Subunit: 351 residues, 4 copies
């Protein structure tokens, strides 16, 4: 079997690996459409995961089931499915506590291109098919469906953790794919004023489409001061961190009102720590709560998000800017994510 | 001054009273636009409230401040304001416990036409102006603004008490003005499938506009069976009670699944009591939570909802079907809320 | 093997049955100590559950592991174990939604004596050993340990659902074993004044020991009037329903304050419906929330409650009033729960 | 009138002030018993809360009403009362939002020795008597009653914000007065294992009395490694920060499990920021929530805590180690808080 893998730190190329076997409760799937992610780039060129030798990359896909284990009861070869990027082991004490994302370990719910070969191969492995897969509606465009697996679930989780009320004012820092879904999520929770922060034109138009009432360019002046001008020195009720450096935490604390909430969905990968400004945090007594976490996965989450798309609660087509046709294009696509052209949001490869 | 009032149970009439005087923290306001509510019909022609002696009616209005006490600091004579139907006494133990709606007594937060002279007069009295009033936006249409004072705040409250999740299925029983706002609120909390119950043609079209994906007519058969057929026998996640008789409670319990929530915003003005079906309620162990409460009021609630309108999160114009001009039309308007002509939702009298 | 079973509605007797076999993830356990429950009396004599035939009874036990499947990793033959009355199927959609108690159906988390052969037999089956068992501490008395499997988990759950604030006034209707654990749980959540309702002397003493500050006898007149006089006409903050007929719901509604919460842990197995008094419920606008649910189970719940006992947070010995030695005493012990002698609370049979 | 005040940074001494006069809703009270706080030390000798001049210190007291405004209805001259350290302005928007502690500004609910003359004077002013005072029980020792005003409300708030589960493992960093009430509060919320961190002998014994199951000291090396050895390398469910430097946030993050909560009640007096270790915080994706807030106040809170003491839920006498007689001893008492003698916890001065 051939697939696109990380040969080592800073090196990637096509390799030959043996096709994975399926256990009694597993399923083997072949990709129909895939999409490169920002995290893939960070593991290869930044060593954000350690040293990996010959590991196939990727964690965002939709495909066809080609083989199932003896105990699989809800799926069979031929089924077209949506695969959530987070596929946890449902039999754990962490699950009994209410935290699927950390089943058997911190972030252990994230398997593809971490401690298991990714989806950028002729075939890939899915653990516990009945608990980690959802059926793909026949009339749903493949491009749009791939956006559910990670972008939609991550951004919407940001709005959920933020505990938004009807009429609350919100600020979203970073307007890339994840940030754009954070804006959409906030509107879908009843937010009044929504302020997006970014600079790339293509992202700015998308931000307004999803619900942004105000746009701020961080390169044109201290972002905190800009927020105060807009709110007449009052601040905002909630803040969502979706992009930028570790210093965005300090900015968030300075703009939120006493009693407000800060929600992080950005994976920080540089430096030794993040800092909380003491005075602005009311010396630790201003009731300014800080939250953050990996997107939830599994079958239920996938089906609920799918239905929202079916009932037109959100239009996912705006996130996809580049579409390719043919297995070999997986290479050209990942390269596109590395160079970050100004006209790019997300790219999908249809096999 | 003159004012339309309830002389006694089943008797209405115009009486001559002394113009109200404001205390140190109060304000006297003259109405600009008002609207009749079905709640007053219950209290008067069915004595659902009790026996009253010469009490002026009405609780939904937009007006102009005329006089203020020596201690009022944020409002002055000539200001245009939005008056919330619930005007709590903020200096009470109930407020300290977190329940403004019951300051100094069960339902006491709501004063107009409950036990205090209402808005259907040349002038009326508002307690604690600085804590219970909100400025009316310059470009905002009067008819629309009146819908915030009661309909919007009650409907959204139903969606808030329901604790809706992203992708949850919801059923709204009763599609009158209040129910329509319940549908709009549910969509704005992330609901997936939304099923509306009613029959009036004008109310049905409005329901779809606000977000309903399915419509059911209770006259065609038992609604529980209808819902089960639509959901292949699964039932729904949430239920909002916005209309009908006491028997609607039993229906909600039967259609909601284990662990779901039932939210009541309907004002039951008759009957000795409501029933909960033992078997369907899982003998009291199915985790089917039942909630119910009076709509929130005060300045903050008014400002937060106002801003949602300003940011186009919801279009209130679809609620106003009838508009009159001239103070004397008040009596005629209140009668319509009793007659209920098939093409009516809410009516406003612009003075 | 033999086991004490329900032959049919109003029928009890010992039967001969085949010893259960274990699957790859199961375990076969032999009982060391068991206890009878009032729920079994509702099932057998009240038929409040449906029809059953030759179903072994009992759901409260501690035992020894005899055999385990090939995939069981944390348990082996020879281990002493605490078995929760609720043993869910962790691989289900209800679990993904946060309601283990209803995995694969309403109340489906509770299997023993509900629809699966109970613990009153020479051996019994436990589904998913690693996920549904807990090790019994070396020096823990068998009689005390049994109280954890149901009484402790149910009573505490009533206090948990009540969302008690520090200093809240509480009324516990019914002072049997479940109500006694409800009083203890309420105290362990920060309650101030705790009023218990009952009559049996032995229970009255236990109520005081667990935290009750006031005791009221329901056979002395209108219980609501009694409560009002004690509270100078103010009412109480919370109410936990743990005993009595369906009319206790009306009483709870009348004595609870607007904005309060009513928590039901009483398994109602008689009648058609429970009544909610219209006027006292503020016509459905008093924010008087009503909850009710089955007790949680699984390995995590058992281990957590176990540790609470080990750290002396609660003394379970006061619940066990009768102790027998020998399998044959199961029949007599169960009958006691039907007739209820004046000096009984709970009984345990050690094999 | 005379009082003990802060002359300037690092300066303390008695001065003369005009006798405070009451407004319509206010009351003038003379102290009967008071106590010094570590907060006062951070303001005077650390210039934490900016620079103050001639401000009377103190915020913990019990006293007698000597004068009331024309509008006061529940309190009269001669009444003995309990005064909560937090006395919020109930007519504010923050109160409408559910945050009394920040009425009219960040931390503005706390007035005494923050920006208003404290209780260390012959007479002091209490805003809104009917909403901010509680009657002192006839037979309640003055020393005990003063511990309600701040220590009890603060420690218990740490437990409340921590959202403790029945059986949760908890670690309390800092075992002084506040940390002691933190341990007591956690037990009254159902905690199982409670590990305290401190070394002072008198505190170590009081900690065990309140509920601590394990005690750790810094001499043994890395506090994290110690916690890991005790927990088999698993960590704990919750962490309450009650004392120590800002580096304790880092320790809390490293010892808490993914999905846990960190609760801060420690008033951090110096430093630019608090540091969060990137890797241990799971790059901000491990769901480790961070909270922190000022203690609640007002009439309801005071009465509720008062009743918890009346019903013997907590014994406050263990906090008072030093008792002085005569107004003049305030200076000596306040100095002890700075010196920190090995046998001190709290000191009370009776007039
Ligand atoms: N006190 C306060 O501040 C306020 C309280 N409330 C209360 O909320 C409630 C809703 O008022 P409103 O919106 O004016 O209601 P309406 O009287 O206009 O009727 C609402 C709906 O109930 C339906 N309905 C009738 N019978 C049934 C049935 N048997 N089964 C299912 N549905 C049925 C409808 O059917 P159809 O289409 O046939 O008419 C109609 O769409 C009222 O009781 C009101 O007092 C609302 C606002 C304020
Ligand atoms: N399915 C499950 O897993 C379980 C369900 N449950 C359920 O919870 C409930 C409680 O069980 P248990 O504690 O064993 O009950 P008991 O049979 O011991 O009775 C408890 C109390 O109810 C009383 N009572 C009777 N009538 C009234 C009344 N009119 N008003 C007030 N109190 C009254 C008592 O009075 P007196 O003092 O005179 O007897 C007694 O104090 C039962 O339904 C049981 O099935 C409990 C455990 C498990
Ligand atoms: N592990 C998982 O399963 C996943 C984790 N995540 C994580 O969430 C995060 C967001 O990813 P993605 O949406 O692809 O983001 P992008 O890389 O496209 O960038 C988003 C934003 O960051 C910007 N930015 C840079 N500096 C600042 C600044 N100083 N202030 C404000 N904004 C700034 C933007 O400006 P400009 O317009 O100039 O670029 C841009 O709008 C990433 O860390 C990602 O790994 C996301 C998906 C999956
Ligand atoms: N503003 C308000 O209304 C109030 C604010 N607060 C605040 O809460 C916080 C606590 O006061 P309180 O508990 O009375 O204070 P204390 O000064 O008595 O000290 C408490 C603990 O801190 C210790 N300690 C020192 N360094 C460390 C460390 N590095 N790690 C762990 N523990 C350490 C202790 O050790 P040892 O045992 O060796 O002494 C002691 O047990 C203070 O900042 C205070 O201002 C409290 C009340 C009111
Ligand atoms: Zn991704
Ligand atoms: Zn109304
Ligand atoms: Zn039972
Ligand atoms: Zn203090």
């Amino acid at each position: 079997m051939k697939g696109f893998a990380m040969l080592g730190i800073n090196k990637l190329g096509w390799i030959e690996k043996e096709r994975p076997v399926a256990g009694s409760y597993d399923a083997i799937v072949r990709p129909l459409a895939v999409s490169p992610c920002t995290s893939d780039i960070h593991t290869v060129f930044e060593g954000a995961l350690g040293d990996r030798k010959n590991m196939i990359l990727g964690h965002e896909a939709v495909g066809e089931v080609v083989e199932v284990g003896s105990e699989v009861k809800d799926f069979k070869p031929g089924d077209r499915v949506i695969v959530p990027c987070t596929t946890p082991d449902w039999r754990s004490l962490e699950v009994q506590a209410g935290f699927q994302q950390h089943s058997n370990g911190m972030l252990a719910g994230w398997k593809f291109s971490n401690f298991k070969d990714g989806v950028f191969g002729e075939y890939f492995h899915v653990n516990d098919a009945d608990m980690n897969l959802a059926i793909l509606p026949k009339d749903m465009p493949l491009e749009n469906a791939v956006m559910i697996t990670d972008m939609m679930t991550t951004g919407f989780h940001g709005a959920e953790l933020a505990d938004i009320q009807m009429g609350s004012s919100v600020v979203v820092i970073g307007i890339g794919a994840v940030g754009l879904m954070g804006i959409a999520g906030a509107k879908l929770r009843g937010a009044g004023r929504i302020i997006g922060v970014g600079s790339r034109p293509i992202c700015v138009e998308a931000a307004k489409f999803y619900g942004a009432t105000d746009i701020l360019n961080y390169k044109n002046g201290h972002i905190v001061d800009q927020v105060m001008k807009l709110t007449n020195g009052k601040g905002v009720d909630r803040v969502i961190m979706a992009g930028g450096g570790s210093e965005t935490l300090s900015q968030a604390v300075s703009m939120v009102k006493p009693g407000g909430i800060i929600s992080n969905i950005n994976y920080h990968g540089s430096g030794d720590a993040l800092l909380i400004p003491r005075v602005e945090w009311g010396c630790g007594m201003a009731h300014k709560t800080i939250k953050g976490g990996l997107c939830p996965g599994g079958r239920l989450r996938a089906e609920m998000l799918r239905d929202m798309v079916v009932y037109n609660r959100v239009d996912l087509s705006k996130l996809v800017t580049h579409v390719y046709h043919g297995f070999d294009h997986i290479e050209e696509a990942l390269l596109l994510m590395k160079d970050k052209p100004k006209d790019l949001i997300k790219a999908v490869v249809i096999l």
